[PDB]
Design a binder for these strands. Structure first.
Ligand SMILES: CCc1c(C#N)c(S[C@@H](C(N)=O)c2ccc(C(F)(F)F)cc2)nc(N2CCC(N)CC2)c1C#N
Ligand SMILES: [Zn+2]
Ligand SMILES: [Zn+2]
Length: 842
DNA sequence: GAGGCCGCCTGC
DNA sequence: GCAGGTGGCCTC
C-alpha cells in the first residue's frame, strides 16, 4: 500500500533514505508538492514540498515537509489571491501516512520585460486573480511582514539528495546569532586572548568601538543627587482656581523618562576563561573596554551637552569587563587630531562615527590630552514625488544622496512654488494626479503648460504621501466608502507605481494608515503591490528617533522591484521618550513589528527644544520682519547643522501669528515653569492692549464630581455640570482670562491638558501642526519663555528643515507647508537604507 | 478675515 | 479613567 521504489541511498544510523515512494496509485519523489489534512477538518489543506524520504527503524516511513504559507495566513488575509502561496522558513519531519495527495505548484517568475508590463486598472490590482493552479512568487517573513524575492540558497554535493532550503537558512541564522571568537592572540595564566570575534554578522577586533547598554558599567564620577521635584506645592486656590485640574503629574513633551544613550567603549581585550585543562571556554566570551565619557557623563553634567557635538566623547583610562553578548553593535571612535579629513566630513561620511580630542580624569576633573596608545559614486535615481508639499521628503532623500527629484506633483500652489524655489531643475505639475496619468496613458508627451510628462523608464523611484479623505475612519468598509477608496488618491498613487514600475517605491502617511477601516486600507495597498510583483513591507517610525525634537509617528510602506534588494527600516539614532515610540501594529489580531532592534537605547542623546531654537532672537507676538539678524553664532550641534557651513547673514521667516489682545494677555500670564498651561492662569481682571477688559471667571454651579475649593467656592461654570440638565445659555461667560469653554467641558476632555501650554526647553514639540492655535487640539504651542506662539522658523526647526530651505506665501501658507512635510532627517534615514540596497544589488 | 467651541473612537 | 488621534464650523 505504501512501498519504497528501489533500494536505499544512505544508511545514516536509524534512518534509511530513499528517492521515490509509491502510495496507492501515485508515486512521490523528492521535489514533489503534496497536501496534508490538518487535525481540524474545517481548516484548509496544508501544502508542502517533499525534500527527503526515509524509513525510521522505530517510527516507520517518514518525509520532510517544507511548508508553503497560504496567502490568507499572511498579513494580506482574505484580500489574497486564493491560489497564491508564499515561501516560508517552516519545515518539519512527518510520517508518510499524513500525506493526502500530490498537488501542482508552479513558480510564477517575473519576466525579463517586467518593467514594461504595467497598466492594469485598479480593479485588477485590488481584486484580480491569477486564475490558474497553485503558484508562488515571493518569500514571506511572518514576524516583519516582508515579501521578498525567493532566496537563491544553493545546495551542496553532499546534501543534494535530502536538501531542504528552510533547514539550511535556519542553520545559517542560528550560527549568525551565536557569538564566536576567531583569531587567538595570546595564552595568559587564566584567560585566552583573541584578536577578533563575531556576533550577529558583525566583526569585532581589538581596538574597535562597541555600543553597550547603559547598565553595562558606571563611571567613576561620584554623581550628586539632583534635587527631586517635591509634590505640587499648595497654591492660593482663589487666585488660581483651575490649578486643581493638574492632579495628574504627567507632562506632555517632557524628557524625564527618556532612556540614557549607549555606553561606548573601545575593546582592549577579547578573552575567554580557561578550563582546568587549559582549553578556553569559548561559549562564554568576555571583553575588556576602556570607558568613554560623553560630555554629560563628566562632572560638568547635562549642560555640557548643550554646545558639544552629538558624537563628541572624551577618552579615559577607566576600564570595565562585560559579557560579549551584551554588545549592542559596533562603532568607530577615532582620535580627531589624526584624521586624514576634517571632523565634519568624517562625521557626515558614515554611520556610528564618534571622535575624541581630549582625555578626561575623573579624580582630577581635568582634561589632559590623550596618551599615545589612543591612536592607530552611485548615480542618483530619477525620482517622481507625488503630493510633494514644499519638499521635505525630497529634501531628505537628496541629503541621503540617492535621488534627483526631476518631477513633482503638488496641487496646492503655495507649496508648489516653495518646491520650485528649492528645486530649480525639477518639473512641478499642479494638475490632479489622475489627469496626468490619463494623459500619459493616452500617449501624450506634454501637459497643457508645455511641461514634458515622465514616460516609462524615466521614473526610477516613486515617493509620496496621499491623503485618505473619506476613509480615515476605523470602522469597517461598506460599499459606499469602498467606492471612495478605489477612486482615491491612494489607489491613484498605486496606479503610478503599476504604470512606471520604478526600482523603489515609498508611501508615507499618518500612523493610523495601518488601522484605517479595520486595516483594510493597508491590506489592500500591500495586496496591490504583491499583485504587481513587488517586494514590499510596512512599518511605523517615530521621527524623534532620527534627530528632531518632535513626536511624529508615520506609517511607511516600502517596495522594491524584482531584481532589487528590499530595504530594511532604519535603526533609531537618538533616544526618545518611550511613550512616543509605540511602533507595533496589530492586523487581524496578529502583531507585527519592523526589523528595528534598538528598543531600549541608542547611539545619540535626544534632541530638545533647547537644541532646536535656543539661538533664535527674541521676537514679539505678531512679529512680521521677514529678514532679521541672528544676533549670534549657532549654539548647539543641531543649530550648527541646520544653519549650514556657509555663513548666513540673514535669518528668514522668524515670524509669528498676530494673536488678538485677549489671547495675547492669556499667553503673558502662562507661567514659565515646565508643564504650565491654561490651568495655571490667574483669575483676575486685566486691561488689554486695545482698551478692552478681561473679566474674572465666576463659578456659578456645584460640580459634585469636582467638589469645591479650599475656601468653599464652587467649581462649575454651567448648569450642565449636573446630571441631566442642559447648557443654560445665560450661564455662558464672555471675555474671561480663564477661557470659559475649558472648565465647561474639561471633565470629558482630560481637562484640556496642553491648551495654552508652553513648550519646555528640556522637552520636545508635540506634532508640528499646520496652524498653531493655543485653544485647538494641539494647543501646546507657546514659546518656553516669550509671550507668543512659536514662529514659522521654530516650526521649521522642529521638522529638521535647514534654515536655507525656502518657503512661500503668507504666514499661514508657510505654517501649513512646514506642518504638512515629512521631516528631512526621517526621510534621510529612510534614504540611507535605500542606498544600501543600491550598493548591494547583484 | 479669526476666534470660540468642542464628539467619537481606540489602547492601556 | 487617562492619554493619543483626527479639524471643522459655527458666528462675528
Ligand atoms: C479635540 C478637538 C476636536 C477635534 C480635533 N482635532 C475634532 S476633529 C473632527 C471634527 N472636527 O469634526 C474630524 C474627524 C474626522 C475628520 C475626517 F473626515 F477627516 F476624517 C475630520 C474632522 N473634532 C472634535 N469634535 C467633533 C466634531 C464636532 N462635533 C466638534 C467636536 C473636537 C473636539 N472637541
Ligand atoms: Zn527543513
Ligand atoms: Zn453647559
Amino acid at each position: 500500500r505504501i512501498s519504497w521504489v528501489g533500494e536505499a541511498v544512505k544508511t545514516d544510523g536509524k534512518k534509511s533514505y530513499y528517492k521515490k515512494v509509491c502510495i496507492d496509485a501515485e508515486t512521490l519523489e523528492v521535489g514533489d508538492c503534496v497536501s496534508v489534512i490538518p487535525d481540524d477538518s474545517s481548516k484548509p489543506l496544508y501544502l508542502a514540498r517533499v525534500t527527503a524520504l526515509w524509513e525510521d527503524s522505530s517510527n516507520g516511513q517518514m518525509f520532510h515537509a517544507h511548508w508553503f504559507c497560504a496567502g490568507t495566513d499572511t498579513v494580506l488575509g482574505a484580500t489574497s489571491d486564493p491560489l497564491e502561496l508564499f515561501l516560508v522558513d517552516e519545515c518539519e519531519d512527518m510520517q508518510l501516512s499524513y500525506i493526502h495527495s500530490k498537488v501542482k505548484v508552479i513558480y510564477k517568475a517575473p519576466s525579463e520585460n517586467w518593467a514594461m508590463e504595467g497598466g492594469m486598472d485598479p480593479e485588477s490590482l485590488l481584486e484580480g486573480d491569477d486564475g490558474k493552479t497553485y503558484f508562488y512568487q515571493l518569500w514571506y517573513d511572518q514576524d516583519y511582514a516582508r515579501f521578498e524575492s525567493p532566496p537563491k540558497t544553493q545546495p551542496t554535493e553532499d546534501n543534494k539528495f535530502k536538501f531542504c532550503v528552510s533547514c539550511a537558512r535556519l542553520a545559517e541564522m542560528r550560527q549568525k546569532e551565536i557569538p564566536r571568537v576567531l583569531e587567538q592572540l595570546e595564552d595568559l595564566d587564566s584567560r585566552v586572548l583573541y584578536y577578533s570575534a563575531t556576533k550577529n554578522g558583525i566583526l569585532y577586533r581589538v581596538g574597535d568601538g562597541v555600543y553597550l547598554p547603559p547598565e553595562a558599567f558606571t563611571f567613576n564620577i561620584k554623581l550628586s543627587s539632583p534635587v527631586k521635584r517635591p509634590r505640587k506645592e499648595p497654591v492660593d486656590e482663589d487666585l488660581y482656581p483651575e490649578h486643581y485640574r493638574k492632579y495628574s503629574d504627567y507632562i506632555k513633551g517632557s524628557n524625564l523618562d527618556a532612556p540614557e544613550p549607549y555606553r561606548i567603549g573601545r575593546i582592549k581585550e577579547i578573552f575567554c576563561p580557561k578550563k582546568s585543562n587549559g582549553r578556553p571556554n569559548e561559549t562564554d566570551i568576555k571583553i575588556r573596554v576602556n570607558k568613554f565619557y560623553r560630555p554629560e557623563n563628566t562632572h560638568k553634567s547635562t549642560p555640557a551637552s548643550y554646545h558639544a557635538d552629538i558624537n563628541l566623547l572624551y577618552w579615559s583610562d577607566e576600564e570595565a569587563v562585560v559579557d560579549f553578548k551584551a554588545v549592542q553593535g559596533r562603532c568607530t571612535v577615532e582620535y580627531g587630531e589624526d584624521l586624514p579629513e576634517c571632523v565634519q566630513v568624517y562625521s557626515m561620511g558614515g554611520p556610528n562615527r564618534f571622535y575624541f580630542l581630549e582625555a578626561y580624569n575623573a579624580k582630577s576633573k581635568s582634561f589632559e590630552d590623550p596618551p599615545n596608545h589612543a591612536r592607530s559614486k552611485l548615480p542618483k535615481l530619477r525620482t517622481l514625488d507625488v503630493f510633494s508639499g514644499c519638499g521635505g521628503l525630497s529634501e531628505g532623500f537628496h541629503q541621503a544622496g540617492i535621488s534627483d527629484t526631476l518631477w513633482a506633483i503638488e496641487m496646492w500652489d503655495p507649496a508648489a512654488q516653495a518646491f520650485r524655489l528649492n528645486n530649480p531643475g525639477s518639473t512641478v505639475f499642479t494638475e490632479d494626479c489622475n489627469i496626468l496619468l490619463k494623459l500619459v496613458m493616452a500617449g501624450e508627451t506634454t501637459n497643457s503648460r508645455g511641461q514634458r510628462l515622465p514616460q516609462k523608464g524615466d521614473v526610477e523611484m516613486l515617493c509620496g504621501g496621499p491623503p485618505c479623505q473619506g476613509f480615515s475612519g476605523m470602522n469597517r468598509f461598506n460599499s459606499r466608502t469602498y467606492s471612495k477608496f478605489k477612486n482615491s488618491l491612494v489607489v491613484s498613487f498605486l496606479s503610478y507605481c503599476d504604470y512606471y514600475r520604478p526600482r523603489f517605491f515609498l508611501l508615507e502617511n499618518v500612523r493610523n494608515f495601518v488601522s484605517f477601516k479595520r486595516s483594510m486600507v493597508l491590506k489592500l495597498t500591500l495586496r496591490c503591490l504583491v499583485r504587481m510583483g513587488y517586494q514590499c513591507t510596512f512599518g511605523v517610525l517615530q521621527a524623534g528617533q532620527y534627530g528632531v525634537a518632535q513626536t511624529r509617528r508615520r506609517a511607511i510602506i516600502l517596495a522594491a522591484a524584482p531584481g532589487e534588494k528590499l530595504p530594511l527600516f532604519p535603526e533609531p539614532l537618538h533616544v526618545f521618550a518611550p511613550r512616543a515610540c509605540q511602533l507595533s501594529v496589530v492586523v487581524d489580531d496578529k502583531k507585527f513589528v519592523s526589523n528595528i532592534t534598538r528598543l531600549s537605547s541608542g547611539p545619540f542623546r535626544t534632541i530638545t527644544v533647547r537644541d532646536t531654537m535656543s539661538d533664535l532672537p527674541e521676537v514679539r507676538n505678531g512679529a512680521s520682519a521677514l529678514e532679521i539678524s541672528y544676533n549670534g553664532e549657532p549654539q548647539s550641534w543641531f543649530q550648527r547643522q541646520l544653519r549650514g557651513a556657509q555663513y548666513q547673514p540673514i535669518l528668514r521667516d522668524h515670524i509669528c501669528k498676530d494673536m488678538s489682545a485677549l489671547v495675547a494677555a492669556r499667553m503673558r500670564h502662562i507661567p514659565l515653569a515646565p508643564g504650565s498651561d491654561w490651568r495655571d492662569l490667574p483669575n483676575i481682571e486685566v486691561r488689554l492692549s486695545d482698551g478692552t477688559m478681561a473679566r474674572k471667571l465666576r463659578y456659578t454651579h456645584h460640580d459634585r464630581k469636582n467638589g469645591r475649593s479650599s475656601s468653599g467656592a464652587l467649581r462649575g461654570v454651567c448648569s450642565c455640570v449636573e446630571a441631566g440638565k442642559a447648557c443654560d445659555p445665560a450661564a455662558r461667560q464672555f471675555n474671561t482670562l480663564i477661557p470659559w469653554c475649558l472648565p465647561h467641558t474639561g471633565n470629558r476632555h482630560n481637562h484640556w491638558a496642553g491648551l495654552y501650554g508652553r513648550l519646555e526647553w528640556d522637552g520636545f514639540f508635540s506634532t508640528t501642526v499646520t496652524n498653531p492655535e493655543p485653544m485647538g487640539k494641539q494647543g501646546r504651542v507657546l514659546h518656553p519663555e516669550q509671550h507668543r506662539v512659536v514662529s514659522v522658523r521654530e516650526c521649521a526647526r522642529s521638522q529638521g528643515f535647514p534654515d536655507t530651505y525656502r518657503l512661500f506665501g503668507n504666514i499661514l501658507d508657510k505654517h501649513r507647508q512646514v506642518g504638512n512635510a515629512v521631516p528631512p532627517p526621517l526621510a534621510k534615514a529612510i534614504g540611507l537604507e535605500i542606498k544600501l540596497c543600491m550598493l548591494a544589488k547583484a
